[PDB]
């Protein structure tokens, strides 16, 4: 690996620097190097990994949607360039998703013993299979979709047994699983039911929280509310 010669702590330090400089490709490369040191990641380190790759793939998804819309308007004969460039961005996006899924499979998930870390990595696995499903059209599209579902579902089962309803990673997992139901699985009623049940059970648990935990949980509850207002 290109980062094999740099200290683990130096990679973490430089990932935080790249975040400040809004250099998210560098940030992702640094955290990939940190993961490949073979040690488990702390809560802070897991978030750095997540933020880096979410920003990288977020720009690729936004670009893919721009090009896909142009491509659809063109097919409503004018040259192969639009399809070619959409395919180029698509292939780069799939490469990043495959890289993240490789880090999770080797060997972040299998070494995640606590519910907190295991749910985190399974939510990541669901997210990046979902991003693969957004662009999928081939023989394996249904298997990609079910791979996202299976990872989300295991994370949901763990979070319901081991976490309170206001736990931020439990809330974020339910939010993204509901987005999966609505946008990928074409199950809007399941999406709405999950978002409502998650919001209501979090609302009833707020009384147990400090001011700092209250802020974290209500932030994600507001995202659930935003989708419910969009969907109903």
């Amino acid at each position: 690996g290109a980062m094999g010669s740099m200290e683990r702590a130096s990679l973490i330090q430089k990932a935080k620097l790249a975040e400040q400089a809004e250099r998210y490709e560098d940030m992702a490369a640094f955290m990939k190097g940190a993961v490949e040191k073979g040690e488990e990641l702390s809560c802070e380190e897991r978030n750095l990994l997540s933020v880096a790759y979410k920003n990288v793939v977020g720009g690729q998804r936004a670009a893919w949607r721009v090009l896909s819309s142009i491509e659809q308007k063109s097919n409503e004969e004018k040259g192969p360039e639009v399809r070619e460039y959409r395919e180029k961005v698509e292939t780069e996006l799939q490469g990043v998703c495959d890289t993240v899924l490789g880090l999770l499979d080797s060997h972040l998930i299998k070494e995640a013993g606590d519910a907190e870390s295991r749910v985190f990595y399974l939510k990541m696995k669901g997210d990046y299979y979902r991003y693969l499903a957004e662009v999928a059209t081939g023989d394996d599209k249904k298997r990609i979709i079910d791979s996202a579902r299976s990872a989300y579902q295991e994370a949901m089962d763990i979070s319901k047994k081991e976490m309170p309803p206001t736990n931020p990673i439990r809330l974020g997992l339910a939010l993204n699983f509901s987005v999966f139901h609505y946008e990928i699985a074409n199950s809007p009623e399941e999406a709405i039911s999950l978002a409502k049940t998650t919001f209501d059970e979090a609302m009833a648990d707020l009384h147990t929280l400090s001011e700092d935990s209250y802020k974290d949980s209500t932030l994600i509850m507001q995202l659930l509310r935003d989708n419910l207002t969009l969907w109903t």
């Binding site: 987005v179 935003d226 969009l230």
Partner: peptide
Amino acid sequence: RRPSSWRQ
């Protein structure tokens, strides 16, 4: 519009 997934 598109729905909201987790964002930092």
